[PDB]
Amino acid sequence: SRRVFTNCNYNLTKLLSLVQVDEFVCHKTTPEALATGCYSSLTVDWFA
Amino acid sequence: LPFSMKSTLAIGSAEAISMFNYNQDYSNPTCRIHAAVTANVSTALNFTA
Numbered sequence: 633s634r635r636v637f638t639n640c641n642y643n644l645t646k647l648l649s650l651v652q653v654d655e656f657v658c659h660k661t662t663p664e665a666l667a668t669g670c671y672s673s674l675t676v677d678w679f680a
Numbered sequence: 681l682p683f684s685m686k687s688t689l690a691i692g693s694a695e696a697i698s699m700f701n702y703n704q705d706y707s708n709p710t711c712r713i714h715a716a717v718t719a720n721v722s723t724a725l726n727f728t729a
């Protein structure tokens with residue numbers, strides 16, 4: 633599944649309270665930037 | 681710290697570990713070592729948890 637989010641705000645630490653992270657691989661960003669900075673659009677592709 | 685949460689000590693992580701408990705400094709050379717003291721070594725020494 634895929635969702636694209638525009639014109640919204642997100643409380644990220646509430647979403648990280650629901651999961652435990654084993655490993656993250658990031659290119660050209662960091663999760664700290666996604667915890668602080670703003671951007672034009674957000675796309676999430678999630679599967680099991 | 682257990683191995684199931686060693687990604688919290690990875691660089692760029694947004695977990696509370698880095699921003700409240702241990703913020704590693706990278707201005708000077710470093711090595712972060714995740715090791716396990718086994719039970720037999722733990723009883724051989726006085727190492728407990």
Ligand SMILES: CCCCC/C=C\C/C=C\CCCCCCCC(=O)O
Pocket residue numbers: 642644647648651653656663666667674676687688692693694695
């Ligand atoms: C439920 C998490 C995945 C869904 C996220 C959806 C929207 C949030 C968008 C950007 C924030 C991503 C930061 C995640 C930090 C995990 C890495 C870590 O610091 O350990």
